């Protein structure tokens, strides 16, 4: 049914970019995983690279500009916030939660008080590449102590249990 798209490592439902269009989008570019962005910025090694990263929209908020919480579904505990302003917001703000995106050459922002999460914005709506729906974006199958469903996010293709609940499945 679905293939692991090579650059993101995600199985995509209804892919919007062909394999050749991705090849030319990636040509000559540095792939940097989301989890590496903090360190790259802190050591000022980010700007000199023509770079791309991948993440899925896991949360949206639109207070006019908007923010997307991104996670790449490979390192499950690492998140960035992407801020959409102007043209980018206008073009892209209605995009579905669960969308896989390539993010290219975004600009680091001031830290958002209380969180050590990388915040980035983007010059230009062409630095956002919509790749399709993340078929394996799901919720943890375990329950909390009180019987409520766990709400932690999961990559269904790799593990059906979040970090906290595997810690306990492994001890079984
Ligand atoms: Zn869980």
Find, among 83, 86, 54, 60, the residue nearest to 155 by Cα.
54
Q: Which residues of 126-147 are buried (b: 16+ CB within 10 A; e: fewer)?
A: ebbbebbbbbbbeebebeeeee
Separation CA 97–CA 111 (nearest Å): 24
Structure solved via: X-ray
Is residue 132 helix, strand or coil?
A: strand
Separation CA 118–CA 37 (nearest Å): 7
Q: Ligand 1 centre and the CA of 142: distance in Å?
A: 5
Q: Ligand 1 centre and the CA of 2: distance in Å?
A: 25
Find, among 118, 105, 111, the residue nearest to 37 by Cα.
118
Separation CA 122–CA 142 (nearest Å): 37
Separation CA 18–CA 43 (nearest Å): 35
Tell me how many domains the chain contains.
1
Is residue 23 helix, strand or coil?
A: helix
Q: Ligand 1 centre and the CA of 59: distance in Å?
A: 18
Is residue 60 helix, strand or coil?
A: strand
Do 153 and 41 contact (CB within 8 A), yes or no? no
Q: Ligand 1 centre and the CA of 164: distance in Å?
A: 6
Q: Ligand 1 centre and the CA of 10: distance in Å?
A: 21
CATH of the domain at 53: 2.40.50.140
Neighbours of 115 (CB within 10 A): 10
Residue 105 Rama label (left phi>0; alpha psi -120 to 50; beta): left
Where does 50-159 show beta strands of DSSP type E? 51-61, 66-71, 80-84, 99-104, 107-108, 118-121, 128-134, 137-139, 153-155
Q: Are strands 137-139 and 118-121 parallel, antiparallel or unpaired?
A: unpaired
In degrees, rounded to 5, the angle at the alpha carbon of residue 91 between the alpha carbons of residues 87 and 95 is 140
Q: Ligand 1 centre and the CA of 167: distance in Å?
A: 10
To which residue do tokens 């910025």 refer?
41
Quote the distance between the C-alpha of residue 104 and its chain's center.
12
Q: What residues make up the domain containing 5? A: 1-172
Resolution in A: 2.3
Do 86 and 107 contact (CB within 8 A), yes or no? no
Q: Ligand 1 centre and the CA of 97: distance in Å?
A: 20
Separation CA 87–CA 93 (nearest Å): 10
Q: Ligand 1 centre and the CA of 120: distance in Å?
A: 28
């Amino acid at each position: 049914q679905y293939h692991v798209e090579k650059f993101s490592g995600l199985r995509i439902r209804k892919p919007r970019v062909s394999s050749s269009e991705m090849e030319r989008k990636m040509n000559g570019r540095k792939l940097i995983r989301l989890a590496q962005l903090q360190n790259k910025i802190a050591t000022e090694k980010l700007e000199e690279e023509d770079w791309v990263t991948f993440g899925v929209i896991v949360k949206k908020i639109t207070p006019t500009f908007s923010i997307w919480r991104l996670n790449d579904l490979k390192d499950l505990d690492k998140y960035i916030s992407l801020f959409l302003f102007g043209d980018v917001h206008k073009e892209h703000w209605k995009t579905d939660q669960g969308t896989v995106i390539g993010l290219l050459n975004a600009n680091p922002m001031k830290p958002k008080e209380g969180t050590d999460e990388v915040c980035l914005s983007v010059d230009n709506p062409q630095k956002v590449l919509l790749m399709g729906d993340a078929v394996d974006l799901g919720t943890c199958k375990a329950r909390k102590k009180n019987g409520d469903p766990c709400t932690q996010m999961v990559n269904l293709n790799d593990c059906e249990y979040c970090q906290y609940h595997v810690q306990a499945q492994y001890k079984k």
